[PDB]
Design an enzyme around this catalytic site. Structure first.
Site, mmCIF file in Angstrom:
data_model
loop_
_atom_site.group_PDB
_atom_site.id
_atom_site.type_symbol
_atom_site.label_atom_id
_atom_site.label_comp_id
_atom_site.label_asym_id
_atom_site.label_seq_id
_atom_site.Cartn_x
_atom_site.Cartn_y
_atom_site.Cartn_z
ATOM 1 C CG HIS B 77 -30.118 17.029 -28.046
ATOM 2 N ND1 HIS B 77 -30.590 18.320 -27.968
ATOM 3 C CD2 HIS B 77 -29.278 16.871 -26.998
ATOM 4 C CE1 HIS B 77 -30.013 18.934 -26.950
ATOM 5 N NE2 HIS B 77 -29.221 18.072 -26.338
ATOM 6 C CG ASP B 79 -34.295 19.107 -28.880
ATOM 7 O OD1 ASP B 79 -33.458 18.195 -29.027
ATOM 8 O OD2 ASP B 79 -35.012 19.192 -27.862
ATOM 9 C CD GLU B 141 -31.370 16.021 -24.123
ATOM 10 O OE1 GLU B 141 -31.544 17.275 -24.142
ATOM 11 O OE2 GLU B 141 -30.744 15.482 -23.202
ATOM 12 C CD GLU B 142 -32.130 20.644 -24.180
ATOM 13 O OE1 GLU B 142 -32.401 20.310 -22.998
ATOM 14 O OE2 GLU B 142 -30.993 21.058 -24.482
ATOM 15 C CG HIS B 345 -30.440 24.439 -20.383
ATOM 16 N ND1 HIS B 345 -31.171 23.512 -19.671
ATOM 17 C CD2 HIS B 345 -29.885 23.769 -21.412
ATOM 18 C CE1 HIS B 345 -31.051 22.330 -20.231
ATOM 19 N NE2 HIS B 345 -30.279 22.456 -21.297
HETATM 20 CA CA LIG Z 1 -29.721 20.853 -22.700
HETATM 21 ZN ZN LIG Z 2 -28.003 18.339 -24.605
#
Ligand SMILES: [Ca+2]
Ligand SMILES: [Zn+2]
Ligand SMILES: [Ca+2]
Ligand SMILES: [Ca+2]
Ligand SMILES: [Ca+2]
Ligand SMILES: [Ca+2]
Ligand SMILES: [Zn+2]
Lengths: 373, 373
Positions: B77, B79, B141-142, B345
């Site tokens: 992904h 993003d 995705e996030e 994150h």
């Molecule tokens: Ca992530």
């Molecule tokens: Zn990821």
């Protein structure tokens, strides 16, 4: 009769149209000072304005005895709750004064002020003999009795008196009130991902478990407690590591309020500790309780004044505080007279005209009864 | 040896410095498209950008067979989570790439993208034979696998494949992931003054009691549940008439997740009703679970590639979802490769250089193993 109904109504309507939201009393206070000076009283200020949540000083207005008989005081507060800027009062055919719906009315407590001003005007124009009377106008009552707490008690000179500020029918007298305490709690857990909940400790679960074993609501006949605010947690996928609780407790017995506050404290601390977290609890007394004996002169005079005007003469115990809660701590026996305001602190607030007339008549009657002791 | 380690590192550093916070993929997307086309792939776009939480279309980039052997897909992904504006990566002597501490790194998931681009460049420049390979680059995705959910599945043509996006060591393969559901509850009570609590019904007490009755945390060996948010009440002196709860549940058994969510729903509803309030409960499936049989070609090829590079070759079950959770619902057997990224994150996110090298080598080895079958 004695009181001028048309004048009392005009005074009340004028007073609600002076903006005096709590903490912002600097407009109404010079106007009230000048009115009580105009009525012949010696008006003194304390230094309450120095408090950062108060907009002006308290007023203590003394009228000399023209007789010796007992020294009376009366108290009302000049501040109102929010929203009360530009109140547009409407007198209706049903016999009630309303706001226009955009504000509160401020009957709480300008009915009490209007009643005091009418009585002084009646005493002047009819030369009614009277003892010493003090009119104590407070600030910040709606910010937690803060004017009363900042009152210079050496300005007071009274054997007993009356707070004109109870939510009860006119002729009902509040003879006792509870101690109230605020109890706040910060419950700390440990953050983890929600997929691995054994790695964390949920402060939400701790606070919920604490509340679920806590004496709350109507704890007993004379004791209450309430969790007012419960806020915590940032995201669904994270174990919540912080909850803030804000609660209160009230009781008419000082030993029962102590037990209740300790109970809430201990339930939070030991529930958090059992589950791997911790609880910081802090407490603050809002006001102390009182109970005036049923045969005290201040009670019996209140009752006689009600009986004389064909009202109930009931004595009750309140669920909350007033400036009389504070003035009682000075050693001046104080009870709280029913004003008969309704739906207070809301934009549906209203005042029955008949209640305003009777309150004014009752305050006059109290002064006359004290004058013949 | 075969992957160009410096070139891989430079590609990774290039990608992290292009802001792609979830929902704002519009800048990075055409930059990635040109990289894939320049490496000899036919690139098609779907219409994911129409979704109001997505800033660009997904890319499906196809590389024709130069051999018949199985058809592979790989997905990462484009993003990242917030905060990832103006990422300033630092390569340190300890063998880790960090941010400057003000943003995330975006190793999640640009390590995956970098690995893909390098492998394509090695295949091109060394003329390594391969079957058909699709490179599926998702958006959002996030934000809850939203680009994968908007993916035009008719662009896909693969027998099996790999999401290069697991929080696990390189050479560890996720072979199963749980069903996640969101559960939210609005608990309503009845307002009253805190001095007369029998006139009301506290939504805080109800919500707390419901939570104490509930199976939560590690519900069983393969099932979890979390109350992530709990908010209600405005004032200590008012019985609270509203609480909003936001919760989740996860399980590796699609029936146990249903049982748990029914259990939570029933406990909220029955507790609210018993105590004189009500509970509005709403549920949403975030993503469905899967479990790929350990004897499947897709699992065995991932483990073989790991053993060939001297890595553990372990197969695990994950705690959460990925684009692989969605792609499995199209009937294409998909497992999730460990990327070796760390502290994702967060502003302490880091990428081991040795893991980046091994991941690119592993993706290359998987393509070679598929090409022999
Ligand atoms: Ca992530
Ligand atoms: Zn990821
Ligand atoms: Ca001030
Ligand atoms: Ca009030
Ligand atoms: Ca009584
Ligand atoms: Ca869009
Ligand atoms: Zn009041």
């Amino acid at each position: 009769g004695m009181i001028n109904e048309q004048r009392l109504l005009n005074t009340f309507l004028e007073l609600v149209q002076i903006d005096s939201e709590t903490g912002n009393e600097s407009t109404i206070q010079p106007i009230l000072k000048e009115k009580f000076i105009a009525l012949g009283l010696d008006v003194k200020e304390d230094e309450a304005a120095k408090h950062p949540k108060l907009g002006a000083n308290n007023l203590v207005c003394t009228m000399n005895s023209t007789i010796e008989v007992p020294k009376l005081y009366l108290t009302s507060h000049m501040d109102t709750v929010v929203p009360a800027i530009n109140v547009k009062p409407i007198v209706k055919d049903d016999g009630y004064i309303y706001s226009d719906g955009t504000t509160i009315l401020g009957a709480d407590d300008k009915a009490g002020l209007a009643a005091m001003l009418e009585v002084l005007q009646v005493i002047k124009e009819q030369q009614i003999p009277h003892g010493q009377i003090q009119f104590v106008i407070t600030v910040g009552e709606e910010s937690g009795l803060i004017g009363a707490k900042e009152l210079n008690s050496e300005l007071l000179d009274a054997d007993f008196g009356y707070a004109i500020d109870a939510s009860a029918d006119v002729g009902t007298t509040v003879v006792g009130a509870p101690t109230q305490m605020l109890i706040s709690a910060k419950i700390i857990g440990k953050t983890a991902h929600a997929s691995t909940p054994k790695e964390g400790v949920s402060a939400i679960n701790i606070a919920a478990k604490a509340i679920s074993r806590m004496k709350l609501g109507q704890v007993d006949e004379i004791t209450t407690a309430n969790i007012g605010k419960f806020h915590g947690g940032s995201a669904t996928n994270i174990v919540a590591d912080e909850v803030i609780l804000e609660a209160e407790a009230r009781s008419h017995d000082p030993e029962r309020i102590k037990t209740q506050v300790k109970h809430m404290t201990d339930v939070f601390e030991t529930t958090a500790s059992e589950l791997g977290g911790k609880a910081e609890v802090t407490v603050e007394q809002s006001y102390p309780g009182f109970k005036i004996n049923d045969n005290e002169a201040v009670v019996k005079i209140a009752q006689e004044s009600a009986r004389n005007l064909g009202l109930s003469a009931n004595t009750i115990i309140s669920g909350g505080g007033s400036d009389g809660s504070i003035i009682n701590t000075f050693g001046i026996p104080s009870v709280i007279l029913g004003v008969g305001y309704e739906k207070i602190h809301t934009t549906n607030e209203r005042m029955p005209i008949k209640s305003l007339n009777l309150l004014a008549s009752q305050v006059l009657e109290i002064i006359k009864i004290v004058a013949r002791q």
